[model samples]
Target chain A: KAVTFYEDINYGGASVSLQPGNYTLSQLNTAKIPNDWMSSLKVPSGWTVDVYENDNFTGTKWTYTSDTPWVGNDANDKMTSVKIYS
Target chain B: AVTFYEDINYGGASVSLQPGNYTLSQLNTAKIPNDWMSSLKVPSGWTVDVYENDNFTGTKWTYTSDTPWVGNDANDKMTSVKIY
Candidate 1:
């Protein structure tokens, strides 16, 4: 399974698909999405994704299930790292 | 069965149990409703060893801290685990 992060809610705008693994936002640096601007996501079945407000998996942690389409206001556009597991 | 998550990053249905050896079936009770956890925070100073098959056989992986995700080969394939 994979996860896709988007620049806008409801999966709009720039995005990237990620395989299951641990990733820091700086590791995801892309001109298409820029920095800490992911507002939505598409997580797959049997997958869990964690969003952190700071790099290296530190700071405020927001856990998410595949069913969550948006990260909500608290974490939107503020994520700096992510951890994906089965 | 310490707390185990169906998905990684500690999201999805979860169950909490005292430390012990556990089969996926035992941990996946009605409340949790699923097996194959992707993430978990092993209790402080504790360690967890996961097996790919029942009875603690097959490939294995060990962890001693908050595991955001299982290793690539072990992910979602753990059928049993021993907490020490």
Candidate 2:
């Protein structure tokens, strides 16, 4: 299973495809993406993704079982790290 | 860097990690065994959390300093860890 992370809501801008794994803020920091840039995502069937508000999966966490066109409310644009699973 | 050892006191199989998040599968990577972590050395000014399950979920243990041995019945139950 895979998940695509978008920088903007409604799958608008810069994005990346990731497989089932754990990604820390430091790892993401070395990449082209910036922290808290995720605004939307698409999760394939049988997969789920969890976004955390802090590094090391601490702080607030949001779990998604289906595709989210937009991540608003308390979790909007606050993703620092993520874990994906099928 | 943060290092995890299979045996306590920083012995046995080990994995040195950068400041980041890691799942058991990633740490194992044909080197260390999964769910076999017993001790850790965390960098100064950093903290880490060990989880009993993947995706950073399940029973949790948080550590801000180095731990030569993970006691309190959490010896070998770590399945994932987040380093910050």
Candidate 3:
């Protein structure tokens, strides 16, 4: 499993890495965490995801681990692929 | 003399950079950057900014140098304090 945090999904932040598997933004932001704000981000209902982390941004550096890295969309069917750095 | 990043007469702001394919609502989502309302939240009549660094939330982010980020809005007026 891969992990994706807020910084991983936003700009001028840090890029996130994943192991590649069935994942959702909802699970990443909510799973193992203790808060409702994660669920409040308003991820979309049903949509496959394709993430991109631009190395151009100084802050957008991605790093993966033994966690899930997929994200979910909002009610409007929108998700963010935040930038990151190592 | 302190260099006003945006404008000496303006909010002492700075310039910003952009990326590809972004959402609008996500652009204006009210986020607590500095544990305080770091954002203008609403630029009023040519927002008279005081400084760059602010404290409203628990986030340590800046609004200058591609900082005070916004998802995307054609209009100069922002609807959300947007996370930086």
Candidate 4:
């Protein structure tokens, strides 16, 4: 007997020059500011949240590996843009 | 060659909503009625508490959802109502 596995895909995306990983996505969900909206946003793999401060950026940023496929927000996505890097 | 993808499905549980969201807003983990009897009483979610005329109704209400709990406090106030 052979076993064939049927699965449901809950996540995926194309490789881009800049994008956080799935792990980081989970981290952002754990952080206070973004925790409330985890149910509505998409997170990348291997990325996590870190505090950042700048004239235009001061919040949790999602940092990923050297190479990550980053994408812009979708029209229906209501998530606020927190920095996504170190 | 490149790749392709599509999806959105996570297995989770949901429960009945109160007649209005506001009714249970107080039940949130951040806030609970200060008058709640921590002991000689049922746990949150498993049982609900109600009072009336400054008297214990003793009617245990069962909700179909999990309830959150906040820390107990002082200056307790009576709800004075009946549980469902």
Candidate 5:
């Protein structure tokens, strides 16, 4: 029902769980998540999380369907927008 | 069906939507910004209602056909919309 975003690798640092939905920079800012600050994430077992490099779901993207301790250098800390699918 | 455009002449960012009511939140979730729609395409017999305020309130414009331009006065004024 939710995916947790982390501010650091290995599920460390500030973390926030969010329900499945599309989120832009304004929405992320409302959720207390700054742009390009997502380092890792935990997705609901069967859910999918799409992380975008820019707001409004544009730019490079990385998809995760399970917990990730690290999102790789190219994608780490690069979540400017996101869409979570249940 | 309907397609909203962010620029005139059917150009710029676009998003096609099926028959339904879409509030500001839903529109944004669909990556469509308010007051940014400059043009759109509407299926024959179908209708598109654009609102100047959220929740389908305030000023309104109805389009039952394609529009290349929403006029300068109506430009960037759609805060919510309904398609049917």
Candidate 6:
């Protein structure tokens, strides 16, 4: 399965789906995922998501194991890179 | 610039890197293998952060100057890096 990231709260803005993989800032940029722009996401059943606050996976990290309409205020618009796994 | 070595004391293979965040792909493209860094030469006033896992996660070590040996916990454990 895959994970989908949304640019607006409640999954209302631009969206991108990504399969299991490690996505660095460059890869996210290539996919049109802007820095510090993620607001929400959908995670496939049994999938895990790790979102980083800085490029190259440094800085703070947020982990998600299921779909959520909102990624929470602290994590809002702060995703620079991410890892998806099942 | 920074110089990463595959062997302690700055021996064996080496690669020079400019200031930037180096994830697994970037490291690999530069001929730096995962868990292969043993030592490094860091420019004065510059900083280097090494991570044991790809994408800069896992165990981490920081260096701001030349290191002949990276220590037991850090030796051959670098997978990603940030040079500034």
List each candidate's DockQ score.
0.03, 0.05, 0.01, 0.01, 0.04, 0.03
Q: Compared with the true structure, what per-residue lDDT tens digits does model 1 show for residues A1-86?
A: 56788889888888787655555554556323356788989889887888888877899999888755678989988888777766
Local accuracy of candidate 3 as per-residue lDDT tens digits, A1-86: 22333332332233333322222333334333221222112122332223323211222223232222333343111222322111
lDDT of 5 by residue, A1-86 (tens): 46889999999999988765567787788878898999999888888888999978899999999999999999998899887754
* Tens-place lDDT digits, model 5, residues B1-84: 799999998999999999998999999999998789999999999978787667664445778899999876568888888787
Model 4: CAPRI class: incorrect
| Error at B59, model 5, angstroms | 27
Best by DockQ: 2
Question: Model 6, B14-58: lDDT tens per residue?
Answer: 999999999988999999888898889998999888876676655
For each model in turn, which proportion of the native inter-chain contacts is also found?
0.00, 0.00, 0.00, 0.00, 0.00, 0.00
lDDT of 2 by residue, A1-86 (tens): 45888888899889887655567787556545588788999999987788999988789999998889978787878888777765
How would you encode candidate 4's per-residue C-alpha lDDT over A26-61 as one tens digit per residue? 333343233223212233444333222221234434
Task: Place model 5 in a CAPRI quality band.
Answer: incorrect
From the highest TM-score down, the ranking of the candidates is 5, 6, 2, 1, 4, 3
lDDT of all predictions, in order shown? 0.72, 0.78, 0.26, 0.25, 0.84, 0.85
Point out where model 3 deviates above 4 Å.
A1-11, A30-77, A80-86, B1-84
lDDT for position A37 in model 6: 95
Task: Give candidate 3's whole-model lDDT.
Answer: 0.26
Docking class of 3: incorrect
What's the TM-score of every candidate structure? 0.49, 0.52, 0.16, 0.17, 0.54, 0.52
lDDT of 4 by residue, B1-84 (tens): 100011112112212223221222343232434344222222244333332113322111222223232113211222332233
Cα displacement (angstroms), candidate 1, residue A16, comes to 0.7
